[PDB]
Write a protein that binds this ligand. Structure first.
Ligand code: OWO
Length: 123
């Protein structure tokens, strides 16, 4: 069975909308979102649909761009580093569960390259 998704709403969190966090939503996430290989990462891994009954038995901190987008829209992050950490968790989860050369890994690799290019310079 699928776990509940990561939390995206928490009114008790200390909240900020920095220039970098606005940029991470308006520019970085929304550009990655339109990439041709973004679709597998636009929502939590559906282990039931994808017949990956061991996915959430190996991956303990799931992450996806749908969750990141919801977090950014809720000002869930205090700084850009917290949000960048979620992107890196998303890519790293993919590389952990899969193997070099798998289609999903090539797709994550492409998105990661673009992600690193877009975050090289923040406001
Ligand atoms: C690419 C691809 N090719 N095929 C044969 C399948 C079933 C896929 C695929 C479709 C949808 C999501 C995912 C996926 C997303 C994030 N992480 C994953 N880890 C393993 N699958 C993951 C996916 F790989």
């Amino acid at each position: 069975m699928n776990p509940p998704p990561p939390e995206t709403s928490n009114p008790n969190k200390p909240k900020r909308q920095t220039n970098q966090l606005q940029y991470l939503l308006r520019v970085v996430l929304k550009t990655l979102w339109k990439h041709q290989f973004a679709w597998p990462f636009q929502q939590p891994v559906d282990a039931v649909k994808l017949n990956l009954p061991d996915y959430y038995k190996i991956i303990k901190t799931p992450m996806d761009m749908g969750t990141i987008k919801k977090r950014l829209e809720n000002n869930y992050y205090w700084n850009a580093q917290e949000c960048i950490q979620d992107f890196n968790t998303m890519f790293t989860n993919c590389y952990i569960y899969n193997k070099p050369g798998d289609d999903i890994v090539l797709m994550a690799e492409a998105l990661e390259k673009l992600f690193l290019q877009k975050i090289n310079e923040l406001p």
